[PDB]
């Protein structure tokens, strides 16, 4: 059998409440619902009792009640609410049934009470399934819990004016919450129904509008088992980065989801829609799985008057509620057949009020006010049931009085001024509160306000345990962790949500948002000033970490050469010294000082505007030996000393003039070689000119040596002549030997200074030996 809640009244008001929750495949609905079914039913009863006793609202007509059960199902709700349309269809079809009794008031002994107005449809699917049947018979509907997005349009569900905001504002609040915690990688869970699908689609829209993506979207059916929920949690666990889980499920739906998550030891930061709410039966048995869960609820306040009325309730006195007895049995785990729980009272047990309670209460008042508008529209003179109230049309009432409600909310707190009104589309005001499941007490759990959304989200992390800095970093769900932007650049695939980052080329730093910046040419990639650093230490190439030895030995040899040359020229009083001219000593001293200056200049001189001077210096250093060879071949060829010195000076001048003419002091240098770890600050202007001048000087030296080698025997001079001839010959041989290695090693610049120092040191040692041979002979 079925139970019908009937309360006599002048104008009966329809009602559809899910007193019974979802049942198994055996029956349509099994266990009774405590928070959703009983509390809202008693709230509607209290609202009707208070309105019937209110002299300022419907003083003459009495508001009856015809309340039915939905069993949290669509087909059951439809077959139950079929009586709502039967009551009108009987009168509609009895128009021609006028023979015996009368013309227009034909009665058959059983006339169902006409349902002028009906409120119900707490579930969105039940709401849309019943709204069509209600509008088919011109019956207005006012909801209190269904927030489906497909009920906003008036083309299909024209006779539907809910007192709650739609899913648009809820999705906005969810998106703002997920953006506040920097949650990017998101997983969603839905249910088989309009509510779940529309909520999920709106959530994906607002997430794509907030640079948030969702990998997989899961859905559940109506008839479900623990195994399917465990499989859903396992599929959610397939991606470890999915720390957050969006839920658009029901109350018992979320309860079984939490049970399955706890059975699988799965940890998630659950974020859900208004289906979760502040219910304790949903989190019952799954306290650990619900730890740190964010829940959004519709904005409302508890009612003190309804709480006192609800607590003072007993099955004996409350005989008007057919389900109250079985609710008492299910709540106190007793049976009235044994007559054992008669002494139990609801006052001792703590009572938790459903958040949406006042909602339906307001709805009732709204409907009542609509009725009051009728009393001010057709029969304003009389107070009792007038003849104009017999035909009730839903179109006029809905389009002129239901949608034009604006009144102070009943049982509202004195601190705030809440006003119930209907918007342009017959929805409610968009405002939500946020709860977080935390262990506020020692062992108990409760819900605490941690923020609210009303045309803008406001949250505080002080009341959120996991978001507080004391607990550490908050649990974040991202597909890819933020890598080091200093040397790792992220690629931009065909997405906007996820990305992968790899280290770019070492010689380029990451400045742009797409590709590592090139840092120009000749600049080292770093982060020193703005984007990278510059190392101008290439020109300053002093160094000599391991080359200090050879250069120090060269300077020591040059100093010893200066010393012995000074000692020799100071010994000019010797008869052997008087046999030679004074010009040879002067030019040899000049050459030794020159090579000493070249040794001292190869390390300390820079490379900015010194390369041309260095080329001229090498030219003069080679011209020293050139003049030596010229005077050697001129003395053996035959006032005379003056002519020889003039010829040597002219040759040196021609050599340096040619060396200066062949080189072109222009502009332009190499930017950087293939390798980019070090920059090059070099005189990359003209080296072909340098090597050509060296080759020409070597050729003239070879010609002079070939001319001089003919007169190997010099009878004018003593055994020093053959000695200096052999010295010139071996210097020419060592020069032609060092020429190819000098031409080949030009690739490496660091070796250039070393080989130049080695060459000048060898030349200096050769000249030192040549000059010390007469000194050793006269020693």
């Amino acid at each position, epitope marked *: 059998a079925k139970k019908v809640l009937t309360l006599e009244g002048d104008l009966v008001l329809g009602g559809l409440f899910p007193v019974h929750q979802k049942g198994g495949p055996a029956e349509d609905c099994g266990p009774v619902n405590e928070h959703r079914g009983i509390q809202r039913l008693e709230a509607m009863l209290f609202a009707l009792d208070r309105i019937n006793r209110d002299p300022h609202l419907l003083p003459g007509v009495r508001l009856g009640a015809h309340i039915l059960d939905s069993c949290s199902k669509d087909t059951h709700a439809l077959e139950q609410a079929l009586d709502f349309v039967r009551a009108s269809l009987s009168r509609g079809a009895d128009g021609s049934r006028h023979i015996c009794p009368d013309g227009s008031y034909a009665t058959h002994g059983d006339a169902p009470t006409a349902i002028t107005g009906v409120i119900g449809g707490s579930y969105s699917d039940v709401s849309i399934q019943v709204a069509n049947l209600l509008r088919l018979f011109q019956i207005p509907q006012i909801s209190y819990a269904s927030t489906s997005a497909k009920l906003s349009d008036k083309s299909r569900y024209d006779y539907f004016a809910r007192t709650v905001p739609p899913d648009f504002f809820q999705a906005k609040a969810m998106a703002e919450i997920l953006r506040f915690f920097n949650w990017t990688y998101v997983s969603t869970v839905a249910s088989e129904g309009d509510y779940g699908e529309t909520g999920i689609e709106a959530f994906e829209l607002e997430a794509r509008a907030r640079n948030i993506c969702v990998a997989t979207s899961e*859905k559940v059916g109506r008839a479900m088992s*623990r195994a399917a929920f465990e499989g859903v949690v396992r599929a959610l666990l397939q991606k470890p980065s999915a720390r957050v889980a969006v839920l658009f499920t029901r109350s018992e739906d979320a309860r079984e989801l939490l049970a399955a998550s706890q059975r699988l030891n799965a940890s998630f930061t659950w974020v859900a829609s208004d289906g979760w709410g502040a219910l304790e039966s949903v989190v019952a048995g799954s306290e650990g799985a619900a730890e740190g869960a964010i829940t959004i609820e519709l904005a409302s306040y508890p009612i003190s008057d309804f709480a006192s009325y609800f607590q003072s309730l007993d099955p004996w006195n409350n005989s008007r509620n057919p389900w109250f007895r079985e609710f008492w049995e299910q709540r106190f785990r007793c049976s009235f057949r044994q007559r054992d729980c008669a002494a139990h009272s609801l006052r001792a047990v703590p009572f938790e009020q459903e958040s949406k309670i006042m909602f339906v209460v307001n709805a009732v008042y709204a409907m009542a006010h609509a009725l009051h508008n009728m009393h001010r529209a057709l029969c304003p003179n009389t107070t009792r049931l007038c003849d104009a109230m017999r035909p009730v049309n839903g179109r006029r009432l809905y389009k002129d009085f239901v949608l034009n409600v604006k009144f102070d909310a009943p049982f509202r707190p004195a601190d705030t001024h809440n006003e119930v009104r209907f918007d342009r589309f017959g929805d409610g005001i968009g405002r939500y509160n946020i709860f977080t499941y935390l262990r506020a007490g020692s062992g108990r759990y409760r819900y605490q306000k941690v923020g609210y959304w009303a045309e803008g989200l406001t949250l505080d992390t002080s009341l959120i345990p996991w978001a507080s800095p004391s607990a550490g970093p908050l649990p974040a769900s991202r597909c890819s962790e933020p890598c080091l932007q200093n040397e790792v650049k992220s690629v931009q695939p065909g997405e906007v949500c996820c990305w992968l980052c790899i280290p770019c080329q070492p010689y380029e730093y990451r400045l742009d948002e797409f590709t590592c910046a090139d840092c120009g040419l000749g600049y080292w990639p770093n982060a020193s000033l703005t984007g990278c650093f510059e190392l101008p230490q290439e020109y300053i190439r002093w160094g000599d970490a391991w080359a200090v030895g050879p250069v120090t030995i060269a300077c020591l040899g040059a100093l010893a050469t200066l010393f012995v040359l000074g000692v020799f020229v100071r010994h000019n009083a010797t008869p052997v010294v008087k046999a030679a001219g004074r010009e040879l000593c002067y030019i040899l001293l000049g050459g030794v000082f020159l090579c000493y200056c070249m040794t001292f200049i190869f390390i300390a001189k820079p490379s900015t505007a010194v390369c041309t001077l260095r080329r001229l210096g090498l030219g003069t250093a080679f011209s020293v030996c050139y003049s030596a060879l010229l005077t050697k071949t001129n003395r053996i060829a035959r006032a005379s000393q003056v002519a020889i010195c003039l010829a040597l000076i002219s040759g040196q001048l021609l050599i340096v003039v040619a060396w200066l003419v062949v080189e072109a002091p222009g502009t332009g240098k190499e930017t950087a070689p293939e390798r980019r770890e070090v920059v090059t600050l070099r005189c990359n202007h003209r080296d072909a000119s340098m090597l050509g001048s060296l080759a020409y000087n070597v050729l003239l030296i070879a010609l002079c040596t070939l001319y001089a080698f003919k007169t190997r025997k010099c009878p004018e001079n003593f055994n020093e002549a053959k000695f200096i001839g052999f010295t010139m010959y071996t210097t020419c041989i060592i020069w032609l030997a060092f020429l190819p290695i000098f031409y080949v090693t030009s690739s490496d610049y660091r070796v250039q200074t070393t080989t130049m120092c080695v060459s000048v040191s060898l030349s200096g040692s050769v000249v030192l030996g040549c000059l010390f041979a007469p000194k050793l002979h006269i020693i």
Partner: nanobody
Amino acid sequence: QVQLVQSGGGLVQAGGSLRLSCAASVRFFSINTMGWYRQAPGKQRELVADITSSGSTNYADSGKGRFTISRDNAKNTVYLQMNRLKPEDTAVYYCHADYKYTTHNTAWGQGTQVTVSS
């Protein structure tokens, strides 16, 4: 969607051998999980046996060792054997099948009453 068909009920003596068979049509549906539930009119449902379809199975609180169940995928059928039954097994047993086609829906079956005497 699909539905489940059961057979093998009736009245048996307490402590006797009872076997229940539950089958269905696959219809290209990837069946991931199948199990058995027990409930009473107006009450809640409780799982008594379930197979993960990967060699792993789970049972109820009073069925740790007994109440063995086996599934064959050639016909997609589940068979559970009953050996020790108390008079508290009057509640009807139901079998469920889990399929994943964008819904993760669970298909149920009819009800076969099982009765036990003294």
